[PDB]
Amino acid sequence: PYKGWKLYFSEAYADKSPFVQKTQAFEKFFMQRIELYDKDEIERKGSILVDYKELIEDRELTKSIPNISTELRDMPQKILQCMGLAIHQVLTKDLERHAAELQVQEGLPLDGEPIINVPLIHARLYNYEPLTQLKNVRANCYGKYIALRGTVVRVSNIKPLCTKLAFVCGTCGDVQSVPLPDGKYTLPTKCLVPECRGRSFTPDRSSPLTATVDWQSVKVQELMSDDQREAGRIPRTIECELVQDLVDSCVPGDVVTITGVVKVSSTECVFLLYIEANSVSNSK
Amino acid sequence: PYKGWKLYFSEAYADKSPFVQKTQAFEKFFMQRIELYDKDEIERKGSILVDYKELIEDRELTKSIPNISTELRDMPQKILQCMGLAIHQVLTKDLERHAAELQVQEGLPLDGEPIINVPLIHARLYNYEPLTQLKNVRANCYGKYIALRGTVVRVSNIKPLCTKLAFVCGTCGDVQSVPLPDGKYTLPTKCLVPECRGRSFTPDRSSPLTATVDWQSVKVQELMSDDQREAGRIPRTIECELVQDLVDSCVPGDVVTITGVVKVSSTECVFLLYIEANSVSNSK
Amino acid sequence: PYKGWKLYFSEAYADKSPFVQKTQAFEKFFMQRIELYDKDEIERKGSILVDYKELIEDRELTKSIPNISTELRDMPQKILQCMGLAIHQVLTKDLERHAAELQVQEGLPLDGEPIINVPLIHARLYNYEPLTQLKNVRANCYGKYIALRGTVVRVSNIKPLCTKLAFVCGTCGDVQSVPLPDGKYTLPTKCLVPECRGRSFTPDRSSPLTATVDWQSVKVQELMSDDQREAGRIPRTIECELVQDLVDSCVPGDVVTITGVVKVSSTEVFLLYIEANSVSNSK
Amino acid sequence: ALRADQVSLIGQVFESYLLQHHRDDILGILRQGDDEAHYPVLVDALTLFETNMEIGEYFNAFPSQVLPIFDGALRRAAMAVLQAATPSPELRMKPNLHARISGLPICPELTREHIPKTRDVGHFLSVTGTVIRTSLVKVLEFERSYICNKCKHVFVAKADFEQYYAFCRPSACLNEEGCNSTKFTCLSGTSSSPSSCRDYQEIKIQEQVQRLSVGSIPRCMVVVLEDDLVDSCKSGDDITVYGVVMQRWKPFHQDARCDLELVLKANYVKVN
Amino acid sequence: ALRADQVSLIGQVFESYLLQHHRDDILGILRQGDDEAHYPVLVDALTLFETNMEIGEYFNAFPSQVLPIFDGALRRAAMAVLQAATPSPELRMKPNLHARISGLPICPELTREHIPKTRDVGHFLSVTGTVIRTSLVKVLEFERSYICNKCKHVFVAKADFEQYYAFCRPSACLNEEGCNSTKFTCLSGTSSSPSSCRDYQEIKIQEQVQRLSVGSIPRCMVVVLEDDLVDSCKSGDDITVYGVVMQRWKPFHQDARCDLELVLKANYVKVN
Amino acid sequence: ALRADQVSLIGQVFESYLLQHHRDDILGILRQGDDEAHYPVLVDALTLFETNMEIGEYFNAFPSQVLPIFDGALRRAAMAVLQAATPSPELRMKPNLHARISGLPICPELTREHIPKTRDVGHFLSVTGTVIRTSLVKVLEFERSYICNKCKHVFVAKADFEQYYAFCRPSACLNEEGCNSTKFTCLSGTSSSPSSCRDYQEIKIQEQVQRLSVGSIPRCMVVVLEDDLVDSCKSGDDITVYGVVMQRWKPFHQDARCDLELVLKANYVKVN
């Protein structure tokens, strides 16, 4: 029906919806830059890195979205999701146009990749200009996009995380997949058929619907100058949660500018902030 | 009714009860002795120290009650609370004459301190003549008043203890305070309202009715003769519980003659004797 | 009739069942050999040591039961129970013959201890020819009888084990004891009373019906050659349960050929632990 | 126990004093961009008490009730100072405002320089102790409200420090929510705004051994830090803590004795 | 179902014996006014056995049953000595009378010098072992008192040595109406005032190495001391713990193995 | 998912390949006396793939489903080899037959030396890692027959690899008649003798640091060995693990996040 309606359109298309305008602005920005990036490399990595200094651009790119920094700060997850929709849609339209061109060239109804199924891309942005160190990091910046400059001290070995868990209900008899934010498995509750309501709550790992993305934990401490003896005090360390392509990007002993949305850790005085990394830029 | 009756005794004021005669005898004894003691200092400390040798004085106190030592041994708490009622009542009646004279001179309808509430004072006696060393202390000493010539080794920092935890009932809608011996909340059960009866049980420390008295735990061990190397072995360490003014009176490394009633350490290896200290007399 | 089978349970001994015929074969074998063993010494020990090598002999020993090694491997518990039943029966019948002689001598039909209850003695087999090393020991060996030549490293102090736990039901008001395999108490469930049917489940130890046997846990490691430096690696060890007379027979630092039944240790994913049948010392 | 009219009087007096006193300070507070940030106003205790004695005695009697009234006075004083100020984009209103009490009237009775005893619960006094243990910045979501499906019900669950900073649990089914009440609502997961989380720190301060009041062993006082006061102090320095003495009690049990430890929810921390 | 006739015979014969030999010891016991120490009477085993053959076999067969009857015989013997004695207030009666049986005839069958195995449960025997670890003196409770408002409850349950010192409550009460509530919890019941709390010192004794009965590693027997016997044992000295061998079993769990370890409720720990 | 006809085709071609190639190995397998023992057939991947291209793609797509069909082909080939062999007592049938696939065709996508990432779950590959820890040989109660109040309940529960070896439960409740059938009574728990095990074990293989693919810290992969593969590897030995990558998830809790780690059920362990 609509572009990316299955996953990204949780809400149906609405011209009044502010989300649509952000999607159009981001997809236009990408469409200017499609020639530079490599489509196959992006699909292989499953993500795209876009410089934030290029994101903050005059005239049309800032006309559609008046305050890009404010919008990214207030709702980092929403803006990143809209940017991912924009990149996924521009890649889909590029593949559609390329398939049409291939059909024109060969002159045959059959074409390569008939399904034209585009895997999900998590758009990522780096070189975020406003940067906050441990002193600026506090509970106020919860749910706000921040940029750090701190070396990683401890790196966890790669571990999986269940981003989507399929739930099969005995009364329903069919599997239901629910989006899962950073684990913490959520009850599906309502189901498709009104009468059954999905009363049974059974996890099902066997289903292909259940998808898994790797989770890597790295702890970063902001750089502390050694010019003074008072300087060099033990620095605060904030945990970093990485996902998908970002895993293995960090290497211990290397300063990384981890610019991403930050969230509290329920498991862990009951919570403590960790930045759910959106992009990691290596020193080299 | 006698002022301060409810704070010391839950059971109502009844002249037929034998405790009344003990209270009157102690009131007379304090009346002879009230000149030496300072009323304001006693009120500030919340305690009074009376030498046991004064308790063993012949004639009247021996005639009024036959066996002070036996009554202290069998029921320490009842005799101690009777003595505290006596000191409270004699202080109240002295203040009553003073307020009566002051009212005579001033002729003011609202007298100074019209509520005239006198804080309850836990009467405490020192130099208890029968000494029961901790080695002599048997399990039958529970509920008995003993005196220990022991050296404190470990002094815990001052920790609050809830002597009264007012319980508000949601069904009733009112707040009722229950006497709380060393925690272990006692269900108020029946209340003033007959029908509601207090079905709900919700603790409420925010209420002013809830009161707290500090609790400092000190462990004492008997000094042992150093004639032989095999001698001088540290005897069993018996815990000691201080409360109210007694807290911070003990200092580690100092011998203290702790004369107090003993209870069982149900809170726990599993059970030890701890003396709920009544009076602690330092070496100096 | 036979004591302890028809009295406890309505079902009688079935000659059709091959287990009963196995008991007959073993009791005949003990009958021909009973001269060497001592009755009172065996009763004092509470068990009889019968050679597996002697039992593996041909002719009537193999004629009575075709595959003695295969039967003993497949269901060691049933074979050992039948063997102990046979030795118990032959000892009882020997004492009955002696009591008959005593009655003839005295001339009084009444005799001391007419009930003549005789303790149950577990039959024990040593020198088990098929030997399984600890490397060979696998989940396939579970439920089978193995013989291992290993040196015990750790011997736990003697600890009681409730082989029989009496149970009294509040509604019923009577006490019955249920057999208990290596602790892990099984609820009595049904009882004699039909209507009450034992709905109340109360474990008690004060009852004399409750019985207890020794349980000494010894851990054995297989003896390793010192020929090569590759040899000397950490040895495989399986826990060994010693019960009844077997306790204190093991001593730390000694090599013992523990020919015992192996079962799973549910407490600690399971690890095979050999419920020892017979422990033969080096000497 | 404060009456509504009395609360209004205290708030009005505090507003007038802080407007006449910290006009430049409140303007500078409104200067910064980050509205979510915590802001100290640093109103002096002794001069405020000289201005009106009733507010002083009420502050001494019930600090835990007076301070929210001071926060409301901050809110409306900020209203007035912003409407007075010319530039709107440069000067933004700060809903996150907290009153800081400093310069307490130096009296042995009014200010307990020693570590407080249990007699000092619900009393404002100036503990002077040297930090020994500095816990990390463990933020806490004080409000874990379970929003009702029906409109205007707005069920709210708030963490209380007396209850060992444990969130209130809606075990009772008095509300129409019933089982829906006790089940968790992932307000924090959906967005930042539904979750009201601001930071929480614990530091233990022992009385200075130089002072004659201290005993044989320096008694340790645990201090709960909040808002901007977090990270204001580091281990190993002389610290003066102006705060409200409070007691926290762990979820209590029938057999267990009550386990209370006195805490000082700091109202102002000054590094000496 | 115990016969009353045999109990009465054992009690009367034992009390007559102890009167005609241990009279002066009972005079000394009552003469000491203090109740601080539980008072032992120390009746010798072999002379008691030779005086009456029935007592010997009953005591060896059922020591845990005989010893309470011996305490009752002590109560009647104390009645007799009190009425016999001339001065009433100098010597007073003591409910806490306990019979300690020592001087057992040294025989391999009578006295199992080696630490008992599971064959020796419920048999009185000498365990000559050197104490290694001494636990702290404990109050415990003779019973977690069952307080019932309903009259003539006449239900008595006591802390069982066999059940790891855990209070036992039968499923159905003896009375026809039964208990008002299945479990009754009261402050008096939780407190040890209604119960006869006694010292409890749990020591572990190992075999003497010089003895031939010891193995490669000395076996260890855990010994429970009660009443006066607590504090009689000191670590590092040889102890001849005449006692009744029993079995403690921890609360059973269906998957878990029945966990029972041998114990010895001491009768008189004579220190060599 | 595989269809029945596809299963039949794959099994038939696998049986034909083993009959034409590994027949002598099957003879050697049935020659051994111990029937309960586990036996490797050692089928080679590249030859099997070049014989039939459908087998290659289907095995690479769904190893976990293909391997049981391979075991069924083992059983049929064992039927054929048993009827082929003249001596009956010498050649005994082996119910415990498990296919071993070795020598994958050299392809970076099919076989990748690196420790698998979460993308590699459900795919067959060669994971070359040096064993660091060798956990003890802990056999698994893989199957426990469950009978309940329901007539002929005969419920069969298999310890699932993805479930951290917790017994599987029906998604749709068949025990509608009573709660007794809903609850599970462990037959193995009551009596030790009746059970069955597959010789479970765990080793962790750490990627060789000398290789270019490995990162700064060599990643470790935990390997689950089942049946005869146990005791085939030792710590500190260069080990190549051809296996099927799956993931275990610990029992979930509402507050707790999904706790998973990649695991590798080895299909062949070869000492380099």
Helix D63-84 vs helix D4-21: crossing angle, to nearest 10: 50
- Of A174, A194, A211, the position where a domain reaches its end is A211
- Going by C-beta distance under 8 Å and a sequence separation of 6 or more, which residues neighbour residue D72? D11
**Cα–Cα distance for residue pair C16/B56, rounded to 1 Å:** 93
For B7, E86, F94, the CA distances from A162, given in Å and listed in that order, are 61, 90, 40
Specify whether A167 is located in the same domain as A275: no
Whether residue A140 lies inside any domain: the answer is no
Joined together, the tokens standing for residue B239 give 């815990």
Mapped onto helix, strand or coil, the DSSP state of residue F251 is: coil
**CB atoms A269 and D186 under 8 Å:** no
Whether residue B109 lies inside any domain: the answer is yes
Specify whether B84 is located in the same domain as B95: yes
Nearest CB partner across the interface for D216, out of B183, B213, B252: B252
Chain C residues touching F230 at Cβ < 8 A: 138
Joined together, the tokens standing for residue D21 give 């006193």
- Going by C-beta distance under 8 Å and a sequence separation of 6 or more, which residues neighbour residue F8? none
User: Residue F180: phi, psi to the nearest 5?
Assistant: -65, -40
Decide the pairing of beta strands C271-280 and C237-243.
parallel
Other C-beta atoms lying within 10 Å of the C-beta of residue D201: 22
Name the one residue in this structure whose structure tokens are 């297989």.
C222
Helix B19-33 vs helix B76-106: crossing angle, to nearest 10: 60
Specify whether A199 is located in the same domain as A219: no
Q: Which CATH architecture has domain E118-137+198-271?
A: Beta Barrel (2.40)
Mapped onto helix, strand or coil, the DSSP state of residue E27 is: helix
Specify whether C51 is located in the same domain as C67: yes
Mapped onto helix, strand or coil, the DSSP state of residue C164 is: strand
- Asked if D67 and D132 touch (Cβ cutoff 8 Å), the reply is no
Start-to-end CA distance of chain C, whole Å, equals: 43
Joined together, the tokens standing for residue C37 give 């063993």
Whether residue A67 lies inside any domain: the answer is yes
With touching defined as 3+ CB pairs under 8 A, do chains E and B touch?
A: yes
A91 burial type by CB count under 10 A (0-12 exposed, 13-18 middle, 19+ buried): buried
Whether residue A232 lies inside any domain: the answer is yes
**Cα–Cα distance for residue pair F120/F118, rounded to 1 Å:** 5
**Cα–Cα distance for residue pair E75/E15, rounded to 1 Å:** 9
B132 burial type by CB count under 10 A (0-12 exposed, 13-18 middle, 19+ buried): buried
* Cα A191 to chain centroid, rounded: 27
Whether residue B131 lies inside any domain: the answer is no
Joined together, the tokens standing for residue C227 give 């020929």
**Cα–Cα distance for residue pair C193/F175, rounded to 1 Å:** 29
- Asked if F236 and F208 touch (Cβ cutoff 8 Å), the reply is no
- Structural domain count of chain B: 3
Chain E residues touching C253 at Cβ < 8 A: 216
Show contacts of D69-73: CB within 8 Å, 24+ apart.
D69/D2, D69/D7, D69/D10, D69/D11, D69/D14, D70/D11, D70/D14, D70/D43, D70/D99, D71/D97, D71/D98, D71/D99, D72/D11, D73/D11, D73/D12, D73/D14, D73/D15, D73/D18, D73/D99
For A208, B197, F64, F155, the CA distances from B168, given in Å and listed in that order, are 54, 12, 62, 52
Q: Which CATH architecture has domain D4-102?
A: 2-Layer Sandwich (3.30)
* DSSP conformation class of F167: B
Specify whether B95 is located in the same domain as B53: yes
- Asked if E25 and E42 touch (Cβ cutoff 8 Å), the reply is yes
Give alpha helix (H) positions in B75-206: 76-106
**Cα–Cα distance for residue pair A3/A88, rounded to 1 Å:** 9
**Cα–Cα distance for residue pair A89/A96, rounded to 1 Å:** 10
Name the one residue in this structure whose structure tokens are 């100096």.
B284
Secondary structure (DSSP) of E161-190: TTTTTB----SS-SSSS--SSSS---HHHH
Chain D residues touching B161 at Cβ < 8 A: 118, 257-258, 260
Specify whether C148 is located in the same domain as C256: yes
User: Residue C43: phi, psi to the nearest 5?
Assistant: -65, -35
With touching defined as 3+ CB pairs under 8 A, do chains A and D touch?
A: yes
- Asked if D256 and D147 touch (Cβ cutoff 8 Å), the reply is no
DSSP-assigned beta bridge partners for residue B262 = B275
Specify whether B38 is located in the same domain as B147: no
Specify whether C272 is located in the same domain as C191: no
**Cα–Cα distance for residue pair A248/D50, rounded to 1 Å:** 64
Chain B residues touching E198 at Cβ < 8 A: 139
The domain limits of chain E are: 4-102, 118-137+198-271, 143-196
> What is the domain extent for residue B199?
162-211
**Please, what sign has the CA dihedral across residues B218, B223, B226, B232?**
negative
Joined together, the tokens standing for residue C55 give 């039992």
Elucidation technique = cryo-EM
Joined together, the tokens standing for residue A108 give 């045959």
Instruction: Give the CA-trace dihedral at B177, B180, B185, B188, to 10 degrees.
Output: -40
Other C-beta atoms lying within 10 Å of the C-beta of residue E172: 11
User: Residue C59: phi, psi to the nearest 5?
Assistant: 60, -135
Name the one residue in this structure whose structure tokens are 């696939």.
F101
Secondary structure (DSSP) of chain D: ---HHHHHHHHHHHHHHHHHHSHHHHHHHHHSS-TTS-EE--EEHHHHHHH-HHHHHHHHH-HHHHHHHHHHHHHHHHHHHHHHSS-TTTS---S-EE--EES----TTTS--SPP-GGGTT-EEEEEEEEEEE-----EEEE-----SSTT-----BEEGGGTTEEP------STTTHHHHS---HHHH-TTTSEEE-EEEEEEEEPTTSTT--SSPPEEEEEEEGGGTTS--TTSEEEEEEEEEEEEPSP-SSSPP-EEEEEEEEEEEE-
**Cα–Cα distance for residue pair A150/A146, rounded to 1 Å:** 13
Specify whether B153 is located in the same domain as B204: no
**Cα–Cα distance for residue pair B239/B274, rounded to 1 Å:** 4
* Cα F141 to chain centroid, rounded: 15
**Cα–Cα distance for residue pair B120/D49, rounded to 1 Å:** 33
User: Residue B280: phi, psi to the nearest 5?
Assistant: -120, 120
- Asked if A262 and A142 touch (Cβ cutoff 8 Å), the reply is yes
- Asked if B255 and B150 touch (Cβ cutoff 8 Å), the reply is yes
Show contacts of E7-13: CB within 8 Å, 24+ apart.
E7/E69, E9/E54, E10/E54, E10/E55, E10/E58, E10/E66, E10/E69, E10/E70, E10/E73, E11/E69, E11/E70, E11/E72, E11/E73, E11/E76, E12/E73, E13/E51, E13/E52, E13/E54, E13/E55
**CB atoms A272 and D193 under 8 Å:** no
A3 burial type by CB count under 10 A (0-12 exposed, 13-18 middle, 19+ buried): middle
Show contacts of D101-109: CB within 8 Å, 24+ apart.
D101/D43, D101/D45, D101/D59, D101/D242, D101/D267, D101/D268, D102/D42, D102/D43, D102/D44, D102/D45, D102/D242, D102/D268, D102/D270, D103/D44, D103/D45, D103/D46, D103/D47, D104/D45, D104/D46, D104/D242, D105/D45, D105/D46, D105/D49
Joined together, the tokens standing for residue E207 give 């075999």
- Going by C-beta distance under 8 Å and a sequence separation of 6 or more, which residues neighbour residue C20? C13, C14
- Going by C-beta distance under 8 Å and a sequence separation of 6 or more, which residues neighbour residue D168? D144, D157, D158, D159, D160
Decide the pairing of beta strands B122-126 and A202-203.
unpaired
For A164, A203, B110, F169, the CA distances from A169, given in Å and listed in that order, are 16, 9, 76, 13
Whether residue A176 lies inside any domain: the answer is yes
Decide the pairing of beta strands C122-126 and C47-51.
parallel
**CB atoms D34 and A268 under 8 Å:** no
Mapped onto helix, strand or coil, the DSSP state of residue F227 is: helix
CATH no. of F118-137+199-271: 2.40.50.140
Name the one residue in this structure whose structure tokens are 């704070």.
B7
Specify whether A252 is located in the same domain as A153: yes
- Asked if E119 and E104 touch (Cβ cutoff 8 Å), the reply is no
Show contacts of B235-238: CB within 8 Å, 24+ apart.
B235/B134, B235/B135, B236/B134, B236/B135, B236/E136, B236/E137, B237/B153, B238/B134, B238/B137, B238/B148, B238/B150, B238/B272, B238/B273, B238/B274, B238/B275
Joined together, the tokens standing for residue D32 give 């910064």
Question: What is the SS3 assignment for chain A?
Answer: CCCCCCCCCCCCCCCCCHHHHHHHHHHHHHHHHCCCCCHHHHHHHCEEEEEHHHHCCCCHHHHHCCCHHHHHHHCHHHHHHHHHHHHHHHHHHHHHHHHHHHHHHHCCCCCCCCCCCCCCCEEEEECCCCCCCCCCCCCCCCCCCEECCEEEEEECCCEEEEEEEEEECCCCCCEEEEECCCCCCCCCCCCCCCCCCCCCCEECCCCCCCEEEEEEEEEEEECCCCCCCCCCCCCCEEEEEEEHHHCCCCCCCCEEEEEEEEEECCCCCCCCEEEEEEEEECCC
Reported as half-sphere exposure (CB side, CA atoms, 13 A), residue D91 has a value of 17
Joined together, the tokens standing for residue B233 give 């072995």
Instruction: Judge whether E254 is closer than 8 Å to chain F, CB to CB.
Output: yes
User: Could you say which residues from 164 to 203 on chain F have a Cβ atom under 8 Å away from some Cβ of chain E?
Assistant: 186, 189
Name the one residue in this structure whose structure tokens are 């240790």.
C265
Other C-beta atoms lying within 10 Å of the C-beta of residue F170: 12
**Cα–Cα distance for residue pair F92/F79, rounded to 1 Å:** 10
Interface test with F, best of C270, C271, C272, C274 (most F CBs within 10 A): C270
Find, among A254, C171, C94, A15, the residue nearest to E170 by Cα. Answer: C171
Specify whether B88 is located in the same domain as B30: yes
Whether residue A133 lies inside any domain: the answer is no
Find, among D140, D133, D134, D174, the residue nearest to D158 by Cα. Answer: D140
**Cα–Cα distance for residue pair E74/E33, rounded to 1 Å:** 18
Helix E63-84 vs helix E53-61: crossing angle, to nearest 10: 130
**Cα–Cα distance for residue pair C77/C73, rounded to 1 Å:** 9
Burial B106-126 (b: 16+ CB within 10 A, else e): eeeeeeeeeeeebebbbbbbb
CA angle, corner B157, sides to B154 and B160, nearest 5? 130
Length of chain F (residues): 272
**Cα–Cα distance for residue pair B29/B23, rounded to 1 Å:** 10
Secondary structure (DSSP) of F94-142: -S-EE--EE-----TTTS--SPP-GGGTT-EEEEEEEEEEE----B---
- This structure's resolution (Å) is 3.7
Shortest distance, CA A191 to any CA of chain D (angstroms): 18
Question: What is the SS3 assignment for E241-267?
Answer: EEEEEEEEECCCCCCCCCCEEEEEEEE
Secondary structure (DSSP) of E194-248: TTT---EEEEEEEE-TTSTT--SS--EEEEEEEGGGTTT--TTSEEEEEEEEEEE
Find, among F105, A92, B248, C270, the residue nearest to D207 by Cα. Answer: B248
Decide the pairing of beta strands B159-168 and F101-102.
unpaired
Helix D4-21 vs helix D23-31: crossing angle, to nearest 10: 90
Shortest distance, CA B60 to any CA of chain E (angstroms): 24
Specify whether B168 is located in the same domain as B274: no
Other C-beta atoms lying within 10 Å of the C-beta of residue A112: 10
- Asked if C145 and C260 touch (Cβ cutoff 8 Å), the reply is yes
Whether residue C48 lies inside any domain: the answer is yes
- Asked if A186 and A133 touch (Cβ cutoff 8 Å), the reply is no
Find, among B256, D257, B265, the residue nearest to B274 by Cα. Answer: B265
With touching defined as 3+ CB pairs under 8 A, do chains B and A touch?
A: no
